[PDB]
Amino acid sequence: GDQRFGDLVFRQLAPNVWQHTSYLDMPGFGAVASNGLIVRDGGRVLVVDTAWTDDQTAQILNWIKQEINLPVALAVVTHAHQDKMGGMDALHAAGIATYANALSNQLAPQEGMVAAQHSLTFAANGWVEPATAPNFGPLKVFYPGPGHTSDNITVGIDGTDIAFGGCLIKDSKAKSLGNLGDADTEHYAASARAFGAAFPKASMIVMSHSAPDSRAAITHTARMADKLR
Amino acid sequence: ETGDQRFGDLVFRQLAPNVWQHTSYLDMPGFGAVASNGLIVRDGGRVLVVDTAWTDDQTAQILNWIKQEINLPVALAVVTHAHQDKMGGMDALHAAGIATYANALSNQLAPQEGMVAAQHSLTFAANGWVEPATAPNFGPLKVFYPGPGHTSDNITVGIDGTDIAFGGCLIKDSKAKSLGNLGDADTEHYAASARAFGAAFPKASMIVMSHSAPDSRAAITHTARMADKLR
Ligand SMILES: [Zn+2]
Ligand SMILES: [Zn+2]
Ligand SMILES: [Zn+2]
Ligand SMILES: [Zn+2]
Ligand SMILES: [Zn+2]
Ligand SMILES: [Zn+2]
């Protein structure tokens, strides 16, 4: 089911949804995968997360041209770290409208990232303010609270079984929560639980640094996070 | 101390013709007391409040002093993050009929932090400035989100037409040895957030903060210098 295309891997998850995967060598870790999503919505394609690099991100656009052949209407990026935002220039070079949590955009310069063009804001219950998410189609954006980072956001894919936890969620086989360097250890557990509650019927949980898992990934992550506080 | 006024457990100091600092104290028997400061602003025929006191009773004491001393209606309050010193008195504000505003994030965190949420949520652009439709009829209050620092949700307030800017718990005074309550702090971004506050209110010469008396702009650069060491 995996398709190799250059140094990237693509996996179809549903009739209109694919997972993109890109790799970066990290000392002591070796080659580290990061996953995002590609969604076909009518005559448009919507992207969740860049690849680690601009060149890899341009390859996502090339793959889309070959396999889907619809224009990319927008991309949303799920926090200000390299695996999610490292390829912003490739999107901007291509004239693609980009969106991130306002806070991600504010942190981007400190994090060595290029800010997205547009900022999302959120209600007190975590749901995106819809005026700030123009023509997002099936992408349903939820801010679960601080966890992996202060700015981390999540995305449900309406009309499918899929929700995307980004780097907040790890799979049920994980022994750790990954990079906690920028994490909120007090609030991480509640944020993970809030993600689950926000998308209560998603059965396929996609995440940045594990292959897709069932809903146990959410609970297992929350329980690991309980031990941080 | 001369010129300061007392009402119950609260102390008030006039900082400018239309601006007072409110000070309340959390007593922890056996140790002493922790002061927290907020602001009261007279804006023509109404009053605006920045931050509650630690408790509902203390906050009601603020409101009664306002009635006694200023005798204008309190239109709204802005609270600057979801911790007890800033939001502990929300129920008293609501019982008094005062409309309450906080960062959306403060409102989201409030249940976990044991606080009552504000009635309305403020949101912010990527440059930190409040999205104006979320802060209707705020008069001279200019609300700025400097980034994560003391907490993820901390906001700051400048008072237009005055030399005053309020850093809340983000800013410490310029003789401080440390940054104080770092339990919920963002150690990586704190220094940048402090600096961003300074740049947002570049002409403010009186810096008001939660846990020190008013200082000059030196408080900002000292805070940032201390914060640089957390990284
Ligand atoms: Zn990350
Ligand atoms: Zn990641
Ligand atoms: Zn960082
Ligand atoms: Zn605080
Ligand atoms: Zn405080
Ligand atoms: Zn806390």
Automatic annotation (TrEMBL), chain B:
GO BP annotations, alphabetical order: antibiotic catabolic process
Binding site for Zn(2+) 1: 81, 83, 85, 150
Cofactor: Zn(2+)
Positions that bind Zn(2+) 3: 85, 169
Listed Pfam families: Lactamase_B
Entry-linked InterPro entries: BlaB//VIM/IMP-1, Metallo-B-lactamas, NDM-1-like, RibonucZ/Hydroxyglut_hydro
Positions contributing to Zn(2+) 2 binding: 85, 150
Chief subcellular location: periplasm
GO terms assigned for molecular function: metal ion binding
Binding site for Ca(2+): 56, 91
Catalytic activity: a beta-lactam + H2O = a substituted beta-amino acid
EC number: 3.5.2.6
Domain of life where this protein originates: Bacteria
Annotated positions binding Zn(2+) 4: 85, 169, 211
Keyword Lyase: no
Residues that hold Zn(2+) 6 according to the record: 113, 184, 188
Localization per record: Periplasm
Positions where N6-carboxylysine occurs in the chain: 172
Top enzyme category: hydrolase
Domain (Metallo-beta-lactamase): residue spans on this chain: 35-211
Similarity section: Belongs to the metallo-beta-lactamase superfamily. Class-B beta-lactamase family.
Subunit structure: Monomer.
Protein name, as recorded: beta-lactamase
The species this protein was found in: Escherichia coli
